[PDB]
Amino acid sequence: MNPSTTQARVVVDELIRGGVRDVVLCPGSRNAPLAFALQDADRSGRIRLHVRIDERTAGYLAIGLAIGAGAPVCVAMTSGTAVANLGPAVVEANYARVPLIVLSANRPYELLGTGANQTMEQLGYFGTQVRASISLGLAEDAPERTSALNATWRSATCRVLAAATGARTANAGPVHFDIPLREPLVPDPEPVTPPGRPAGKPWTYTPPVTFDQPLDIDLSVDTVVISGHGAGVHPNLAALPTVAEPTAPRSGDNPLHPLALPLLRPQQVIMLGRPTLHRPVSVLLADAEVPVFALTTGPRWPDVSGNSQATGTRAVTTGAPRPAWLDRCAAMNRHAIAAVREQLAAHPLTTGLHVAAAVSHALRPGDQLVLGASNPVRDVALAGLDTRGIRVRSNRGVAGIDGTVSTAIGAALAYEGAHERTGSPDSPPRTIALIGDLTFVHDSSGLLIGPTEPIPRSLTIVVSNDNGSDVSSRIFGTPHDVDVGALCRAYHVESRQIEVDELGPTLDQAGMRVLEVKADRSSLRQLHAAIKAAL
Amino acid sequence: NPSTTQARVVVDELIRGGVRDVVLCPGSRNAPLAFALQDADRSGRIRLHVRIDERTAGYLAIGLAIGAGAPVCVAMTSGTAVANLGPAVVEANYARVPLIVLSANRPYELLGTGANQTMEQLGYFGTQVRASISLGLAEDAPERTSALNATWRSATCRVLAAATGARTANAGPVHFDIPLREPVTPPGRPAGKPWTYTPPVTFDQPLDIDLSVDTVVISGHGAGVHPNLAALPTVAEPTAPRSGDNPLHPLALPLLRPQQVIMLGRPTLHRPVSVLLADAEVPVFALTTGPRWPDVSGNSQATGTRAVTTGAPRPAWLDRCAAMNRHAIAAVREQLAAHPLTTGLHVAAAVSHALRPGDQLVLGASNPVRDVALAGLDTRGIRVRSNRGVAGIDGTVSTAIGAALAYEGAHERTGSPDSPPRTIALIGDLTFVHDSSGLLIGPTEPIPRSLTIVVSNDNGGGIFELLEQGDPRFSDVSSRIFGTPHDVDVGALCRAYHVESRQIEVDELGPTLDQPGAGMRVLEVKADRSSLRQLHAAIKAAL
Amino acid sequence: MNPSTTQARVVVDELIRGGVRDVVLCPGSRNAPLAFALQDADRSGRIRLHVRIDERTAGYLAIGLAIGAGAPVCVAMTSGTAVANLGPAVVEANYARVPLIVLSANRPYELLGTGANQTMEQLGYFGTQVRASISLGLAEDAPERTSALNATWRSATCRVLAAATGARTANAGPVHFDIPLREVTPPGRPAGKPWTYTPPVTFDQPLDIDLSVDTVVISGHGAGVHPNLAALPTVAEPTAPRSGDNPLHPLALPLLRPQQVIMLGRPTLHRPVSVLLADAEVPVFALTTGPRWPDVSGNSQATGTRAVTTGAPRPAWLDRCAAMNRHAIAAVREQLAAHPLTTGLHVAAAVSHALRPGDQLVLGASNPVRDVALAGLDTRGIRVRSNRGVAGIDGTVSTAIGAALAYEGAHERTGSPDSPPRTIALIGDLTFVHDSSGLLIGPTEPIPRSLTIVVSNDNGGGIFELLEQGDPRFSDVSSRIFGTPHDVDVGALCRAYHVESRQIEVDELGPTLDQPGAGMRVLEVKADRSSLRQLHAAIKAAL
Numbered sequence A: 001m002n003p004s005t006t007q008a009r010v011v012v013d014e015l016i017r018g019g020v021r022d023v024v025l026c027p028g029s030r031n032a033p034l035a036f037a038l039q040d041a042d043r044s045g046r047i048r049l050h051v052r053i054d055e056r057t058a059g060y061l062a063i064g065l066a067i068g069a070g071a072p073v074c075v076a077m078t079s080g081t082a083v084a085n086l087g088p089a090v091v092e093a094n095y096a097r098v099p100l101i102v103l104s105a106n107r108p109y110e111l112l113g114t115g116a117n118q119t120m121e122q123l124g125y126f127g128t129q130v131r132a133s134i135s136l137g138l139a140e141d142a143p144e145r146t147s148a149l150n151a152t153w154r155s156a157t158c159r160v161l162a163a164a165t166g167a168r169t170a171n172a173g174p175v176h177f178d179i180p181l182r183e184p185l186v187p188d189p190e191p192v193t194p195p196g197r198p199a200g201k202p203w204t205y206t207p208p209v210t211f212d213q214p215l216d217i218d219l220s221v222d223t224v225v226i227s228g229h230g231a232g233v234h235p236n237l238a239a240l241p242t243v244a245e246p247t248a249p250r251s252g253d254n255p256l257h258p259l260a261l262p263l264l265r266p267q268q269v270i271m272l273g274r275p276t277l278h279r280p281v282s283v284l285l286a287d288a289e290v291p292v293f294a295l296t297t298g299p300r301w302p303d304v305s306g307n308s309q310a311t312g313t314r315a316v317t318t319g320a321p322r323p324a325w326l327d328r329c330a331a332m333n334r335h336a337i338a339a340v341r342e343q344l345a346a347h348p349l350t351t352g353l354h355v356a357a358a359v360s361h362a363l364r365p366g367d368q369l370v371l372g373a374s375n376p377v378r379d380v381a382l383a384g385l386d387t388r389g390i391r392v393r394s395n396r397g398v399a400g401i402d403g404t405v406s407t408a409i410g411a412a413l414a415y416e417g418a419h420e421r422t423g424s425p426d427s428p429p430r431t432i433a434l435i436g437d438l439t440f441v442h443d444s445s446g447l448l449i450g451p452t453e454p455i456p457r458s459l460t461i462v463v464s465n466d467n468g469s470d471v472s473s474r475i476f477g478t479p480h481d482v483d484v485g486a487l488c489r490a491y492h493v494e495s496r497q498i499e500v501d502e503l504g505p506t507l508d509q510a511g512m513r514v515l516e517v518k519a520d521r522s523s524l525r526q527l528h529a530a531i532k533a534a535l
Numbered sequence B: 001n002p003s004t005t006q007a008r009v010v011v012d013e014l015i016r017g018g019v020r021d022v023v024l025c026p027g028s029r030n031a032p033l034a035f036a037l038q039d040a041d042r043s044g045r046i047r048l049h050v051r052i053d054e055r056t057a058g059y060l061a062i063g064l065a066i067g068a069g070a071p072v073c074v075a076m077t078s079g080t081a082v083a084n085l086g087p088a089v090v091e092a093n094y095a096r097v098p099l100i101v102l103s104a105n106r107p108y109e110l111l112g113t114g115a116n117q118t119m120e121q122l123g124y125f126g127t128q129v130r131a132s133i134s135l136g137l138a139e140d141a142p143e144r145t146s147a148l149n150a151t152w153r154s155a156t157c158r159v160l161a162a163a164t165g166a167r168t169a170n171a172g173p174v175h176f177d178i179p180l181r182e183p184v185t186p187p188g189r190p191a192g193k194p195w196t197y198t199p200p201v202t203f204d205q206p207l208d209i210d211l212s213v214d215t216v217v218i219s220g221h222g223a224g225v226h227p228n229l230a231a232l233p234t235v236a237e238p239t240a241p242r243s244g245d246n247p248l249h250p251l252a253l254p255l256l257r258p259q260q261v262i263m264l265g266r267p268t269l270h271r272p273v274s275v276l277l278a279d280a281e282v283p284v285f286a287l288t289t290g291p292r293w294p295d296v297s298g299n300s301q302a303t304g305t306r307a308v309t310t311g312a313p314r315p316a317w318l319d320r321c322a323a324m325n326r327h328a329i330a331a332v333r334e335q336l337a338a339h340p341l342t343t344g345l346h347v348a349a350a351v352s353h354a355l356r357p358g359d360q361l362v363l364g365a366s367n368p369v370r371d372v373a374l375a376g377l378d379t380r381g382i383r384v385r386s387n388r389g390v391a392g393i394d395g396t397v398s399t400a401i402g403a404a405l406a407y408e409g410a411h412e413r414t415g416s417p418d419s420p421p422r423t424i425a426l427i428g429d430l431t432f433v434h435d436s437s438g439l440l441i442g443p444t445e446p447i448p449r450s451l452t453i454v455v456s457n458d459n460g461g462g463i464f465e466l467l468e469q470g471d472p473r474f475s476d477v478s479s480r481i482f483g484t485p486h487d488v489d490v491g492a493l494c495r496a497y498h499v500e501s502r503q504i505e506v507d508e509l510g511p512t513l514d515q516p517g518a519g520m521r522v523l524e525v526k527a528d529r530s531s532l533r534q535l536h537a538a539i540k541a542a543l
Numbered sequence C: 001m002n003p004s005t006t007q008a009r010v011v012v013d014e015l016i017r018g019g020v021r022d023v024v025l026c027p028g029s030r031n032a033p034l035a036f037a038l039q040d041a042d043r044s045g046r047i048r049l050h051v052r053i054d055e056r057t058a059g060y061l062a063i064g065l066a067i068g069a070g071a072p073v074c075v076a077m078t079s080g081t082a083v084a085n086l087g088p089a090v091v092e093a094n095y096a097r098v099p100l101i102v103l104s105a106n107r108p109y110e111l112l113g114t115g116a117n118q119t120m121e122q123l124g125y126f127g128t129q130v131r132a133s134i135s136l137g138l139a140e141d142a143p144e145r146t147s148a149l150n151a152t153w154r155s156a157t158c159r160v161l162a163a164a165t166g167a168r169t170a171n172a173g174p175v176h177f178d179i180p181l182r183e184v185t186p187p188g189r190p191a192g193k194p195w196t197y198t199p200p201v202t203f204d205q206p207l208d209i210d211l212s213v214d215t216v217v218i219s220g221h222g223a224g225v226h227p228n229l230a231a232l233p234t235v236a237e238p239t240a241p242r243s244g245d246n247p248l249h250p251l252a253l254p255l256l257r258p259q260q261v262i263m264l265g266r267p268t269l270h271r272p273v274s275v276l277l278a279d280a281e282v283p284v285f286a287l288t289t290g291p292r293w294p295d296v297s298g299n300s301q302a303t304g305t306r307a308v309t310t311g312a313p314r315p316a317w318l319d320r321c322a323a324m325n326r327h328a329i330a331a332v333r334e335q336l337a338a339h340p341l342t343t344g345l346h347v348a349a350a351v352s353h354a355l356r357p358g359d360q361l362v363l364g365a366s367n368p369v370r371d372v373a374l375a376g377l378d379t380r381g382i383r384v385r386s387n388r389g390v391a392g393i394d395g396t397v398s399t400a401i402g403a404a405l406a407y408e409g410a411h412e413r414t415g416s417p418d419s420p421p422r423t424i425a426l427i428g429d430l431t432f433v434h435d436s437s438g439l440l441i442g443p444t445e446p447i448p449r450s451l452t453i454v455v456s457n458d459n460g461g462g463i464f465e466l467l468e469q470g471d472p473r474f475s476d477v478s479s480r481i482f483g484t485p486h487d488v489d490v491g492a493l494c495r496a497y498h499v500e501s502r503q504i505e506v507d508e509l510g511p512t513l514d515q516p517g518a519g520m521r522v523l524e525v526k527a528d529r530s531s532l533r534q535l536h537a538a539i540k541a542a543l
């Protein structure tokens, strides 16, 4: 067995032992050793392989596969700009703390600077965006060194997995795993792979760390909880008035609408996760006089407030909220919900806010909701969606528009896969995505799934199409006019154009499909004005 | 505002430096130099191109630079901009493309405490750019305006010189930061001159070479023109300029025993070229411009910039090379005619026969750039572009679009309204799907008048049929992981972007190309890769 | 007041609230970041400032000040050579996890990248070595935003401190903190509290371990204290804290067959240790704090932070280890007694016997740190320091000086009358010559009160006598390129710098150390390395 084939099979086996259930693969020749070993593992049923053509959107597919079920996910590609194309997903995975392993094949490092084809400064390309930049050695033809090389290869693979899942740091994120490879790149004619640990165990076992930092907080002070992306679950704060972003997990049943917050005067703030969504949240955390307490699941804590008194992972609570304060916040929340609902009905034309409210009402527990990181996530929060029992995904790391379609497809695939391991047909759970037309058009090639590749069993993408100071904004002066139906036809995906009233019934009833709901953009500044005035 | 004055000085000096096109993307904050660029665009001193896709924007800028050889600016204005521009910047480094990346830091804001909307840095700027220059923050000091104007225009000329290789002969990408505090132009030199003028430079490294020794010339990407080598048998890549009129077909090379090799530029094509270059019994002389020389095996005897020649090739050696060249040409022509199914090689031959002088030819990676060489294209009189720096299949649509725009722009300024010269791109289907978003161009934005993109579509990566993983013993496992079939409806995709497109057979390709159409159009030719490996085998057996 | 002046004190006040007691500065072309605010706090006794001319020794002085009492230390860059000269100290701070804050001041109103930079001339190591890189904004003249700026500045300074001390990461290390400049101090928290408080954190990773299996504990740099492991036979490096009472000598390890290993922290010494850790039939469990784990061989079975033990070591196993422990120690001492020439090993044992609880011991690399382990030093009650992060022989003099000052300062604020506790440094002769400039301390500058530097001078590098290049077959060539004799007059060297020094024999050492002297003194013991390979051979024969 030639060295490239031996090394690739060892790495793939150790990744599987580490909990990697899904791998994204992009075509090339230099990554052939990885592609062969990955195809074997898929044939054996040890992993599910997903082949894609465009490395950039393939990275967001891997992000979706990771956030859908919480497992580390590898994306593998050839040397050169294929690696550079993972840049956007790596940045998103860094700030959203997604265990994304970039498994890049490379020419031998000795060829760097020789003019060799398709070769570049690959290792270190991602800078400080990755949790680690790790290189295997070039595989030596040293059969007597086989046992030693098996240990070092599997150990390096375990270092990669630990860094990506945050097993020791509690700060999951992307990892660059560069593997220099040389000829022969394809397996030899048959006419054994060095084995891992017994019982399928990982070569170096590192259990998931428990990161703990308790913090004293007195709940008698009029307190509001603001929870953002990556927030933990705190039972002892469940009673408090909580402004929760759609991707934050709910700890209780005392919601406070984001619009209600600037109309109240909290005397202290408990901040969970990384809240970046709302402008009244940004405004209040900008107020240097309001003391803030930051509770995070990991060592990072957000910089959105300059008055963070302390950090922790959990609250040690004394006291209890004033009943008058609870009554006041509850009243203002009811008031904000009513204002939004009244103005929506009093608005004749369909807006993206209407589409978002319709999608919000159509959801039922067990659904997974994937939200475009710009308008959809804001609109759903404006419509006051109740996320309890719903799994809400959104690329809130840097909130780019790249890869939103691929992230939805990947999250559905991973979510449906976690259902299969339960044991049951009761049918696979629903994944519903809400994406704007510009985001959808930009990542429409994320729809492309080859005839041989896994297709989501129950994914519906709702496209809210409203047809779209510096000079670059002239691009928005005109509706783009892109035919969404033609786009879906191009990538052989079923699509239907429907009205908002039809959306709920149609979501009740194709595999993967796109439902396009036309909406109007002109009348919205007035609609938001009406909502604000009705508060 | 001092920052508005500084921005106007910089744009003016960039225009004096030959910048004709700037690429922008809508962003989290305003673009660097945003208003000065808008002022210049309205005046017609410069031309702005706006895109939503930041990755395709980078490759658009590369095309705008290689189309006519001018420095091009791209202004990065978002938290994903550095990540998305990576591919184009790397290609600009390795293909030596004068690409100026504009940024606008905010010295009054914090850095390193969290996500940065203005710039999220990766690690490639340290390795890829020729220079990283930051202007000062512009201060209000009316009494120092002459000194500041001199400082700003001097630094701008440094950015331009580093990007174009004015003094280094090593063009490449440059990072140019004009910082901002958020939230009559001092003149330049008389007669539109650049503030700091860089007159022509020569790097001279002559090498003594005896041409009576049986010699072949291999000319790759970035090769120079050597009149004293014009008589030699020459295996020229499509992007190499031709010194002479003695072509040697790539497939004829293994049928020969060269005694020495002159290597011009950077070779990226053909395993027989790589084998010959590594042969320790064959002296190799590398003639290239710039700091580094290509030598994968380490076998090269000497490197320089030009040859001082004695002797001449033996007529028998020239006859032998001409005879094997004839065999190779005949084998390709005869086996293509004998082959029933249309392949990408068929499409490449059709494109080659249809070109004429003045055409610009843009070649995608994979089989197209190789197939054009196998079809024996005569590149004299035409300009051939291809992103051979890293040979990516990403961004080729915007590269072709940018190349057409810059090429048409240079022609309009000559002043003869003969119709704009043609740009014809030949790319594979995977290459097309990779960069299909480059077809999305707003009516506000410049659009080519004479660009035709030929997509040879064999529903996958045909080159992998020709490699070791294309051997029949991998036939059960190779379709998914190397073939990567996709079943995309190309006509529908072009419909969605409102781009004229036709699906035609290889015989109609020539006539359809002879007759113009919309400013941009996509001609799709269905092709087969199932017979590809056999076809190349039949060609080799006919040599 | 100038906004920069306000910002500078806000930062210095928050640094002092963060436990910074010492700051190291060097004279540069530009004055130091926060220079006046540091001057103010020095005069008021809020911090102690240390000035050095040598920028390299200044960085290692800062490391000593940090490891002496565990406090974060700031070092202010001021020149065009500071980055390069601080490199070695930053790399050691990274690998030894030392909280070192590197202060810089970029000037955003000036140009960058056109050449010519006088306050930070960058290298490539900052990206790889630091825990964070933070830049305050430029101070902006907006008195209506005074309270908001105060919060932003104190919040960012706490980020810097938390990253340096590992307050939330348990991964202390160096941090780059830039306060940019341009050519009634707002209050912090009440009661001297830091602006952002970080309560204690725990990283918990329990591993099930069966102590009935024959287990040896090996503890290296950065090892934790594990009570449930105190009974096990333990080979503890000198800088490792002892969890218990059952020592196992390093030389006994080859005479034993552990069936599993518990590794604490990072082992760097002893080939038998490395051999055992790499044994594929021996399960290895790594218990260490922080993001990474040591495993050169890739052999380790599991990593974590603590053990969940079942069972107890077999009495037969315990007795065998105790037996070979006693045997190993006896062999070292008998062979040292039999040996007729003073070697570094003799000096190590002498210093070892002279130590008493409350002492601080600073060990150079090479033979000193190893010899002390071979002399069986019982480190309980002793603070042992050594630059094991990357194990350079550079900067050890200033590390000891800084560690002494921090240790004496910590003792002083207990307020006690009691002689400031002792710091005893044991370093080789090359190590001493390497960092001899660390002796040069201005009368203005803080100077230790209880520091004795013992130099075991064998006129070269003794450790090479014990390696493969020490084999007699290399005798003709090995002295020049490995021994590197220098013939320096060490007494004249200390006299040039006005430092007390005595050249004494090894019998005098214990008595001389027992007796107090000048604040800083050097005792030099001449040693022989010609017989060192033989002596080590004699010790192993006695096993």
Ligand SMILES: Cc1ncc(C[n+]2csc(CCOP(=O)(O)OP(=O)(O)O)c2C)c(N)n1
Pocket: A027, A028, A029, A055, A078, A080, A081, A082, A085, B344, B364, B365, B366, B367, B368, B391, B392, B393, B394, B427, B428, B429, B430, B431, B432, B456, B458, B460, B461, B462, B463, B464
């Ligand atoms: C960004 C990038 N990803 C992957 C590759 C590897 N690669 C080289 S050729 C090729 C096949 C391209 O297929 P197509 O464009 O259809 O051309 P064909 O060979 O089929 O004519 C691939 C995936 C690359 N060069 N660049």
Ligand SMILES: Cc1ncc(C[n+]2csc(CCOP(=O)(O)OP(=O)(O)O)c2C)c(N)n1
Pocket: C344, C364, C365, C366, C367, C368, C391, C392, C393, C394, C427, C428, C429, C430, C431, C432, C456, C458, C460, C461, C462, C463, C464
């Ligand atoms: C800066 C640096 N240079 C070189 C080395 C390599 N090195 C390791 S031990 C050693 C010899 C040290 O000699 P000495 O300080 O006299 O101690 P001895 O072993 O002689 O007791 C050298 C040069 C190093 N560790 N650091």
Ligand SMILES: C=C(O[C@H]1C=CC=C(C(=O)O)[C@@H]1O)C(=O)O
Pocket: A027, A028, A029, A030, A031, A078, A079, A117, A118, B271, B366, B463, B467
């Ligand atoms: C041209 C060859 O492979 C190239 C073409 C496609 C994919 C490649 C890759 O991804 O490594 C190779 O660069 C060859 O080996 O002859």
Ligand SMILES: [Mg+2]
Pocket: A436, A437, A438, A464, A465, A466, A467, A468
């Ligand atoms: Mg829209």
Ligand SMILES: [Mg+2]
Pocket: B428, B429, B430, B456, B457, B458, B459, B460, B461, B462
């Ligand atoms: Mg193809």
Ligand SMILES: [Mg+2]
Pocket: C428, C429, C430, C456, C457, C458, C459, C460, C461, C462
């Ligand atoms: Mg010595």
